[PDB]
């Protein structure tokens, strides 16, 4: 997360850390949608162009964390993966269309002050909250700057980061990039003439873009950090997997087997 701030404790109880077993490293963000289901970005697991292909046995999931590297005693919970489900039509070849994957925990996890699931939007909620100008929230332990090129400042945070960003109208999203956009994604971030800054960055994928419903006071996950070009660059916007549009595939795997 670039130009965001340290999150308050328990501010994003659904935040999930995808951890690689060997070597040990944080590879992506994710979100808890139930006591046994985790949602993330497909390319965090499978991205053939970089020879990336992670299996259930290669990862662990860390839930309830705040610090990026410190083990958090009786606060975080570490779970194993029973099964990984990547959208069958995930397009890794050109634009990461349908950048989504579900992860089934081996055992259900107990909730606490630090561990609680986020809601998935319904028809009315989606149609109501997804409007240009409306602000959502993105969280993550990803890079604080572009790290592939010399730059001042630390690369990653010691604590979970948060930033609030405005949803952007499709035409503006489309003409800001040469990459082909689909209805299965949306972009957010401040325009060149708004002043404020902020964006997701490498390491933040899988992380959730959430919005609070003024109606029932619940938090819903509208997006999944998917991609961008550079981080927080003027005239550029971060792109997110449109969760609601993939709702049917999500329900189908979630309710597929008994339990």
């Amino acid at each position: 997360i670039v130009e965001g701030s340290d999150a308050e404790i328990g501010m994003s109880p659904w935040q999930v850390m995808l951890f690689r077993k060997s070597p040990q490293e944080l590879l992506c963000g994710a979100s808890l949608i139930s006591d046994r289901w985790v949602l993330t970005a497909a390319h965090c697991l499978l991205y053939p162009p970089w020879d990336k292909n992670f299996t259930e046995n290669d990862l662990l999931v860390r839930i309830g964390k705040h610090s990026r590297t410190r083990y958090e005693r009786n606060i975080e919970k570490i779970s194993m993966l029973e099964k990984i489900y990547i959208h069958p039509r995930y397009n890794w070849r050109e634009n990461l269309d349908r950048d989504i994957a579900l992860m089934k925990l081996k055992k259900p996890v107990a909730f606490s002050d630090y561990i609680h699931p986020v809601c998935l939007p319904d028809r009315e909620t989606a149609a109501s909250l997804l409007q240009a100008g409306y602000k959502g929230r993105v969280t993550g332990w990803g890079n604080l700057k572009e790290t592939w090129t010399a730059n001042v400042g630390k690369g990653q945070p010691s604590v979970l980061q948060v930033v609030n960003l405005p949803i952007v109208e499709r035409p503006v999203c489309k003409d800001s990039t040469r990459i082909r956009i689909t209805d299965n994604m949306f972009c957010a971030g401040y325009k060149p003439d708004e002043g404020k800054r902020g964006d997701a960055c490498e390491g933040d994928s899988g992380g959730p873009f959430v919005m609070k419903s003024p109606f029932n006071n619940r938090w819903y996950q509208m997006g999944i950090v998917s991609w961008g070009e550079g981080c927080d660059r003027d005239g550029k916007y971060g792109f997110y997997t449109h969760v609601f549009r993939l709702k049917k595939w999500i329900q189908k795997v979630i309710d597929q087997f008994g339990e």
């Binding site: 060997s22 046995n57 990026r68 083990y71 570490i78 630390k154 990653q156 945070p157």
Partner: protein
């Protein structure tokens, strides 16, 4: 009261009978005592049933009282902590059916040389087991099966030569493993399994670095940041990791996390990573 000190607050009673040359529990103490300190006495023999009353007792300290025989009789359904360290026990007491709500057991620095068959049977709530400073040579298979909730295991300063390949099976919450200052030369196949171990102490052992020290070889590699050197208490072993503390043959300059298996079978299975370069940069 006339013998020990008594205090209350939060509603819990805490009696302190330390260093009072006692050979048995003093004359009737508060029936609502929660904490009982019987340290440094002369309890060569002690009967648990003698505490049967005081049904609100949760913490019992019988350390440094040269106990060689603990009579496990009655029950203490609310006893959570039990310190039996620095005594003369030669056989581990079977506290299963007697102490069901026990979560912390310390039988450190005694005279144990081996552990019973169903040693921990019935202690499903156990979170911390301390057996440091004894003379165990081998641990029995399934020792921690009855304690799936274990978070800490201390087996330091014993006479262990080899660990049961499946010792850590289960243990979904194990975060601390102390095996320093033993007689270990190698680590079984998948001893550490898939679980993440935040704090491990493996120094002070004569690791024989050959071809079957490779599993442990890579594990150390992956867990380089989770290996620490025990110093003492209050230090909080969360200060500066130190994987190099694990040396071949306990031979200083021969860290195990830097031992090329030269002419060892399968050129790609144990320690076959370290493929790419990384350049991390976090802050305070």
């Amino acid at each position: 009261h006339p013998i020990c000190e008594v205090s209350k607050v939060a509603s819990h009673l805490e009696v302190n009978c330390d260093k009072r040359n006692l050979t048995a529990l003093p004359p009737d103490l508060p029936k609502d005592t929660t904490i009982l300190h019987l340290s440094e006495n002369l309890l060569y023999t002690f009967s648990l049933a003698t505490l049967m009353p005081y049904t609100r007792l949760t913490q019992l300290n019988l350390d440094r009282a040269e106990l060689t025989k603990l009579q496990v009789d009655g029950t203490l359904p609310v006893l959570g902590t039990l310190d039996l360290s620095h005594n003369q026990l030669q056989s581990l007491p079977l506290l299963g059916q007697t102490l069901p709500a026990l979560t912390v057991l310390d039988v450190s620095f005694n005279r144990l040389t081996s552990l019973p068959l169903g040693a921990l049977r019935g202690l499903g709530e156990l979170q911390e087991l301390y057996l440091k400073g004894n003379e165990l040579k081998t641990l029995p298979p399934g020792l921690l099966t009855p304690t799936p909730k274990l978070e800490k295991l201390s087996l330091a300063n014993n006479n262990l030569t080899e660990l049961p390949a499946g010792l850590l099976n289960g243990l979904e919450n194990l975060d601390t493993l102390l095996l320093q200052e033993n007689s270990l030369y190698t680590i079984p196949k998948g001893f550490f399994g898939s679980h993440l171990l935040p704090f491990a102490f493996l120094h002070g052992n004569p690791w024989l670095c050959n071809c079957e020290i490779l599993y442990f070889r890579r594990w150390l590699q992956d867990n380089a940041e989770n290996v620490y050197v025990w110093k003492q208490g209050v230090d909080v072993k969360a200060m500066t990791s130190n994987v190099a503390s694990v040396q071949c043959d306990n031979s200083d300059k021969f860290p195990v996390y830097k031992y090329p298996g030269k002419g060892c079978p399968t050129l790609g299975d144990e320690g076959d990573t370290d493929l790419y370069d990384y350049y991390p940069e976090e802050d305070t």
